[PDB]
Design a binder for this molecule. Structure first.
Ligand code: ZN
Lengths: 78, 144, 208
């Protein structure tokens, strides 16, 4: 419940940039940002853990209005 | 042309896949031979070496069909039939501008490889079993 | 004899610090008390490793050295680099010829500029407090931001110009925050054009 899926991320996006962005909407506990370790490449998605369900659900509701590198960011419950 | 030889910040040498340090010029190129470099090369031939190559351009006979190339090939004397492959223009010996089309390439051992430009995206299938025939006795090669 | 991590965590007034190995000590209560004493620093991370503390820095290439700025403003790097690249063209004939017939005054810069750069323009470096030890990864963990401010780097990537006009500049989640409320988790967040004045509270937002 406290974790949201973030999608449509350009692979140039860093974990600090995701953190800066999502801390505008609520305190973030941690970010899991999957990486191909052979190529050192991010894979277009991340999981952002908020401190509670209410914070995560609030994030999902207010989060579909951002473009990063021109790509619209999708935020969904997981 | 070794892509793993690195010189570090203090004037020594390093194998990058092996992650190994070497003091002098002669201790890297004696490590490229050795059980650490070869097995890591395998983790990361003979027939290619002995290919006879005169480089003689055979005679092709292109012809617009409708429902085909006719290559006259002098004797090979081997069991292996001539082989085709579809290759892109992206890699070439000179790499000049205008690359962006495909070549139907034909080869057989003793003699030169032949290429045919295809500007259409799809018209035929450049496959070996489906669509080639080898008249080995008269030595004419087929492909449609 | 060696009671486990559970009972040791129960006994110690600060079980934050007791680790996997402290139950295998010869005095666990003292060791975890000294691990939780006030201004001590912990043991280095590589006491249990297998790699001799820096033999994992093998393949990574690094810059040579950045000279400090007050020394770079003496011109010594440019003169010395030009002199090394001039000496790299000399054969041994001219290298042993200018050993007996030397042309001097190749740099001869001045002494007032050097005495200025060590006494007038001396710069305090960026030191660190006494707890902050070093581990092998340390200089590449550099990731170590706040609500209501967005960096120039993030604003380029978002396409969000920094300006003071709280309504055209705002982040694109403004309209949704007017509809759904302010952050559930930032009760005191103030956003210009919502619950802070538009031209007055131009820092994007602030906790107040
Ligand atoms: Zn090697």
């Amino acid at each position: 419940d406290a974790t949201v899926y973030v999608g449509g991320l350009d692979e140039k996006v860093s974990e600090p940039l995701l953190w800066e962005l999502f801390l505008q909407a609520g305190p973030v506990v941690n970010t899991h940002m999957p990486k191909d370790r052979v190529t050192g490449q991010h894979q277009g998605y991340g999981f952002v853990e908020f401190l509670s369900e209410e914070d995560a659900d609030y994030a999902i509701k207010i989060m579909n209005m951002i473009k990063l590198y021109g790509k619209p960011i999708r935020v969904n419950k997981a | 042309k070794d892509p793993y030889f690195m010189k570090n910040h203090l004037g020594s040498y390093e194998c990058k896949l092996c992650l190994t340090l070497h003091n002098n010029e002669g201790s890297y190129l004696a490590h490229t031979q050795g059980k650490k470099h070869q097995t890591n090369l395998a983790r990361r031939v003979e027939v290619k070496k002995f290919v006879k190559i005169g480089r003689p351009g055979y005679k092709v006979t292109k012809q617009r069909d409708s429902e085909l190339f006719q290559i006259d090939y002098p004797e090979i004397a081997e069991g292996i039939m001539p082989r085709h492959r579809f290759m892109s223009a992206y890699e070439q010996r000179i790499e000049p501008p205008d690359r962006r089309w495909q070549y139907l390439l034909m080869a057989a051992e003793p003699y030169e490889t032949i290429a045919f430009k295809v500007p259409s995206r799809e018209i035929d299938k450049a496959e070996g079993k489906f669509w080639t025939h080898w008249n080995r006795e008269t030595k004419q090669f087929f492909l449609q | 004899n060696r009671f486990t991590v559970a009972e040791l965590k129960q006994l110690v007034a600060r079980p934050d610090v007791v680790e996997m190995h402290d139950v295998t000590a010869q005095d666990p209560k003292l060791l975890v008390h000294l691990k939780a004493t006030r201004n001590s620093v912990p043991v280095p991370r590589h006491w249990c490793f297998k790699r001799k503390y820096l033999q994992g820095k093998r393949g990574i290439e690094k810059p040579p050295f950045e000279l400090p700025d007050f020394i770079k403003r003496t011109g010594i790097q440019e003169m010395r680099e030009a002199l090394q690249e001039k000496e790299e063209q000399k054969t041994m004939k001219s290298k042993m010829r200018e050993k007996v017939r030397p042309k001097m005054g190749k740099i001869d810069i001045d002494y007032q500029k050097l005495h200025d750069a060590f006494f007038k323009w001396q710069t305090k470096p960026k030191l660190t407090i006494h707890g902050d030890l070093y581990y092998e990864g340390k200089e590449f963990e550099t990731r170590l931001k706040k609500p209501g401010d967005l960096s120039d780097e993030l604003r380029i990537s978002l396409g969000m110009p920094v300006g003071p006009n709280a309504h055209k500049v705002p982040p694109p989640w403004l309209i949704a925050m007017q509809r759904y409320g302010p952050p559930p988790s930032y009760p005191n967040l103030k956003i210009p054009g919502l619950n802070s004045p538009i031209p007055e509270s131009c820092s994007f937002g602030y906790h107040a």
